[PDB]
Design a protein around this ligand. Structure first.
Ligand SMILES: Nc1nc2c(ncn2[C@@H]2O[C@H](COP(=O)(O)O)[C@@H](O)[C@H]2O)c(=O)[nH]1
Ligand SMILES: Nc1nc2c(ncn2[C@@H]2O[C@H](COP(=O)(O)O)[C@@H](O)[C@H]2O)c(=O)[nH]1
Ligand SMILES: [K+]
Ligand SMILES: [K+]
Ligand SMILES: [Mn+2]
Ligand SMILES: [Mn+2]
Ligand SMILES: [Mn+2]
Ligand SMILES: [Mn+2]
Ligand code: NA
Ligand code: NA
Ligand code: NA
Ligand code: NA
Lengths: 270, 270
């Protein structure tokens, strides 16, 4: 059992369609390597105390959320934190309702105004019962914004998040620093004011979509350039699409850089 | 390879939270029997011609849609048909976009007015590009209504659906007859005018949630009463929650009635 630590689980490391795509397309990925089967991008963040009590926070609830949590072996949840309101990050939100029953209280969710206002449009019934329904709401909303730290309380003690702005094509997404672990998915450029949060990480988890340029995400080469500038002790690539085969990318990257895989798990001091 | 037939695949046979729930709760289900692991409710309907060309239609696109299609081994899709606009039936809709690329045309979707109007609210970006986006739409909407047959064309020939009304607690859901296979999920009562569609089926796929009453779904005992009245040659139970263990329900039900399981597949003449 984990003790006196933060524990991170890469619940999903794929691009928006997953790997393979729904049509069975593996791209250039070796279909025989289980690490190439990729769920939609999400991170589990836990804090364990000396007795093994935990605070549990998920970053994003995409379509794979239920299976991600089942496979993680972690059976409770304190909060959900959102990066941005794209389908692959939000469409599993209904599956929070089991925890609301278990906890006896609304699920605390954290989102910027852009994200919150999109969640209210898509999923209003999770916040307020509509005309003609008897389903109670399930979520309690909290604002977050770049450069404003926030803390989530729970049984293992507080987990302090440091949000910051990312450019994501035509919209903004959030990245987060949690201690000296940084999570940067769905990012095509880093604004200058965000750099303080991303430099000198023990572990930088950074999106690298594919080899070729894309308007909304770093290419592998762009992510590697950022890794060189930001000097993380270790980097883990995420949000990886079907052109990026695990073994191939492992060989192509520096020793301290690896492609992620679903279920990748590590502990750090806190 | 299938030939000269309709082929049905029970893509999912669980209740809205799945089995187990996201918190690892199996209820009374034996966790060691793989048939108790249940995805959200969905049916694949195919028609094969003499040469093995197929028309492929899915009923509902819930959160498990991507994995359901991958595991089915069927790598193309002609249309999606919807029963009603609950989370467990619609929140996988974004994953249709791969097929739009493969087919070179918008995905044809079929829904009643209630369902369509909810899809436009939750998922408007799938129909019309919003302000501030460059993502093209992916869906082409078609109306369906009880007691009005409709046909979907494709490579294997047309598949004719006969929709009908079901009471589902405080809303209406659709059931469908396809030849002499009937699909009745998310139903708490059958209106009189729907009975002609549901009687004398070769296979009746009918929702049975749990043993105890529920406002929105038949209990096992209620579904069995309907099966006795409607005299299907075979019945398959679906939308089954955590109280309903596969082996137990198999023993408790008549010979011609079985609990479903994910991946249950059969062929019938057409
Ligand atoms: N919820 C939502 N998802 C969107 C919108 N526009 C595009 N998407 C979906 O968001 C995902 C974008 O993928 P990305 O490449 O940023 O990982 C795709 O699944 C795409 O179809 C939108 O306006 N709202
Ligand atoms: N999309 C949507 N889902 C709903 C609404 N109200 C409840 N739900 C969800 O729909 C499902 C209802 O489950 P059922 O028992 O009918 O299978 C649950 O996942 C529930 O949280 C709503 O207004 N819209
Ligand atoms: K490497
Ligand atoms: K039986
Ligand atoms: Mn994404
Ligand atoms: Mn995105
Ligand atoms: Mn349902
Ligand atoms: Mn329903
Ligand atoms: Na805990
Ligand atoms: Na770019
Ligand atoms: Na076909
Ligand atoms: Na009832």
């Amino acid at each position: 059992s984990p003790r006196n630590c933060l524990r991170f689980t890469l619940l999903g490391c794929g691009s928006s369609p997953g790997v393979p795509r729904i049509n069975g397309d593996w791209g250039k990925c070796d279909p025989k390597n289980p690490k190439n089967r990729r769920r939609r991008a999400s991170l589990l963040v836990e804090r364990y105390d000396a007795e093994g009590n935990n605070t549990v926070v998920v970053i994003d609830t995409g379509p794979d959320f239920r299976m991600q949590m089942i496979d993680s072996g972690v059976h409770m949840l304190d909060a959900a934190v959102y990066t941005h309101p794209h389908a692959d990050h939000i469409h599993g939100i209904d599956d929070l309702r089991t925890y609301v029953v278990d906890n006896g209280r609304l699920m605390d969710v954290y989102a910027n105004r852009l994200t919150r206002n999109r969640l209210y449009d898509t999923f209003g019934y999770c916040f307020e019962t509509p005309v003609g329904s008897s389903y109670p709401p399930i979520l309690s909303m909290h604002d977050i914004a770049p450069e404003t730290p926030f803390s989530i309380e729970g049984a293992g003690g507080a987990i302090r998040f440091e949000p910051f702005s990312q450019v994501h094509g035509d919209i903004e997404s959030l990245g987060f620093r949690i201690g000296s672990v940084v999570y940067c998915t769905d990012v095509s450029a880093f604004p200058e004011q965000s750099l303080q949060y991303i430099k000198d990480a023990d572990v930088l988890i950074i999106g690298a979509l594919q080899y070729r340029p894309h308007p909304s995400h770093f290419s592998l080469g762009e992510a590697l350039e950022w890794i060189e500038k930001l000097s993380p002790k270790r980097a883990i690539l995420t949000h990886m699409h079907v052109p990026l085969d695990y073994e191939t990318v492992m060989r192509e990257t520096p020793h301290h850089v690896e492609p992620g895989y679903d279920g990748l798990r590590f502990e750090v001091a806190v």
